[PDB]
Amino acid sequence: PGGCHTDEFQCRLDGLCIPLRWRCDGDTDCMDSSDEKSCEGV
Ligand SMILES: [Ca+2]
């Protein structure tokens, strides 16, 4: 399963799929944090 839906994100803790537009916002749509535990800035 090399993806979910359009450029969406998959979390290796659990397996869920999240709307990847929300990988750099500071709150966490995945079952952990991996949205943005790697999307720093300034
Ligand atoms: Ca998020």
What is the secondary structure topology, with strand pairs?
Elements: E1 9-10, E2 17-18
Antiparallel strand pairs: 1-2
This protein binds calcium ion (CA).
Structure description:
The PDB classes it as lipid binding protein. Keywords: LRP, lipid binding protein. It forms a monomeric assembly. The entry is titled "low density lipoprotein receptor-related protein complement repeat 8". By secondary structure, the protein is largely without helices or strands. The chain has one domain (1-42): Low-density Lipoprotein Receptor. The chain contains no helices and 2 strands. It has strands spanning 9-10, 17-18. The radius of gyration is 10 Å and the shape is globular. The relative contact order is 0.24. Bound molecules: calcium ion (CA). The site of calcium ion has 7 residues, from loops. Calcium ion (CA) binds at residues 22, 25, 27-29, 35-36.
Comma- or semicolon-separated keywords:
monomer; 42 residues; little secondary structure; Low-density Lipoprotein Receptor; two-stranded antiparallel sheet; 2 strands; 10% strand; binds calcium ion; Prolow-density lipoprotein receptor-related protein 1
Helix fraction, binned, reads under 10%
The CATH superfamily bears the name Low-density Lipoprotein Receptor
Distance between the termini: 34 Å
Number of strands: 2
If helices are DSSP runs of H or I spanning 4 or more residues, what is the number of helices?
Answer: 0
User: What CATH first level would be assigned?
Assistant: Few Secondary Structures
Along the chain, the helix and strand elements come as EE
Largest sheet: number of strands, sense, barrel closure: 2 strands, antiparallel
**Which CATH architecture would you pick?**
Irregular
Q: Strand portion, in percent? A: 5-15%
Note the overall shape.
globular
PDB class: lipid binding protein
Keywords: receptor, ligand binding, calcium binding, ldlr, LRP, lipid binding protein
Assembly: monomeric
Entry title: low density lipoprotein receptor-related protein complement repeat 8
